[PDB]
Amino acid sequence: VNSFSGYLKLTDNVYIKNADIVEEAKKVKPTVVVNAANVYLKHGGGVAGALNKATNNAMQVESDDYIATNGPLKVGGSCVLSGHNLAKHCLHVVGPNVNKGEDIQLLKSAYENFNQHEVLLAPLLSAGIFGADPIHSLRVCVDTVRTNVYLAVFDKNLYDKLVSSFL
């Protein structure tokens, strides 16, 4: 039993809700919140910009030190950093950005990072400003993640389309 509330159950392990991931994280304080990161951990917009803003830019400060030490992530890769005031940890995961020409096949590799964590609050990877089809992202999520994932979908219209079209 966990404290996630109001989710629709899609499969044995995947749950979904129309919610602002920032507000969900502030309420639940999950062990892991997933960020829709880029390889530079530059949290400018989309989910990343919103999460970072909610930390009063502390996420960005921590991320800049991480990059200065370690260099950029790989597309499809991840790193674990602090969750600040939102969660215990933030798993920064880089899905392919279609608006940069990146290989959509890397979306499966990106979701594989979730399997290193028993329970996660997450957005759909590569959705929104990353330019992928969210219906496809949900399919890859369900077919790749085996741990317990609670998906927050900001757009109500999109949430309804994802549920209604789910096979």
**Contacted entry of Cl ion, ligand A1BAV, none for residue 14, CB cut-off 5 to 8 Å set by kind:** none
Q: Cα 64 vs. chain centroid, distance in angstroms?
A: 19
Number of residues this chain uses to bind ligand A1BAV (CB under 6 A): 16
Best CA proximity match to 51, nearest among 90, 15, 79, 95: 90
Neighbours of 153 (CB within 10 A): 24
The residue (of 2 and 126) whose beta carbon lies closer to Cl ion is 126
Q: Is 163 in the site for Cl ion (CB under 5 A)?
A: no
Nearer Cβ to ligand A1BAV, position 76 or 134?
134
Q: How many residues does the chain have?
A: 167
* Chain residues 128-157 in contact with Cl ion, contact rule CB under 5 A: 128-129
Q: Assign 3 to helix, strand or coil.
A: coil
Strands ordered across the beta sheet of 89-93: 8-9, 14-18, 148-153, 119-122, 32-36, 89-93, 78-82
46 sits near Cl ion (criterion: CB under 5 A):
yes
Instruction: Please identify which residue in 13, 17, 20, 139 interacts with ligand A1BAV, judged by CB under 6 A.
Output: 20
Going by C-alpha positions, the residue among 22, 14, 13, 10 that lies closest to residue 59 is: 22
**Which residue lies nearer to ligand A1BAV by CB, 50 or 65?**
50
- Contact letters for ligand A1BAV, residues 46-65 (x by CB under 6 A): xx--x---------------
Nearer Cβ to ligand A1BAV (143/155): 155
Q: Measured from the CB of residue 154, what is the shortest distance to Cl ion in angstroms?
A: 7
